Amino acid sequence: SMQINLNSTDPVPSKTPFSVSDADSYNKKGTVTVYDSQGNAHDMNVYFVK
Amino acid sequence: LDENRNLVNMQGMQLTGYPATGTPPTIQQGANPAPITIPNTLMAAKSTTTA
């Protein structure tokens, strides 16, 4: 569970579609972590294009 | 600054932060804030492509 709120003065991210971390390609970034059965951890990035 | 110039308190512990990265450095608000370093670095010889 992760919740976001936005203001719509944002443009199209000029470089569309989104890509991992190129700076113009997302209106916001989000991060959250998950787990698996080995006991590892992954980190997830969440991005928004509007 | 520590001797790596990672910012630390009286007991060497790293003052984590949201990293301005990319070029120009852009605030990664919401990335895991982690140990922040102020190391001196060359001012990149980057072109005058548009002036």
Q: Residue A26, exposed/middle/buried by CB under 10 A (0-12, 13-18, 19+)?
A: buried
Q: Which one, of B24, B26, B20, lies nearest residue B38 by Cα?
A: B20
Q: What is the resolution of this structure in A?
A: 2.9
Q: Does A50 touch chain B (CB under 8 A)?
A: no
Going from the C-alpha of B3 to that of each of A3, A5, B12, B38, the distances in angstroms are 39, 40, 10, 10
How was this model experimentally determined? cryo-EM
Q: What DSSP state is assigned to residue B9?
A: -
The label of the residue with tokens 């944002």 reads A10
Distance between A42 CA and the closest CA of chain B, angstroms: 13
Q: Residue A49, exposed/middle/buried by CB under 10 A (0-12, 13-18, 19+)?
A: middle
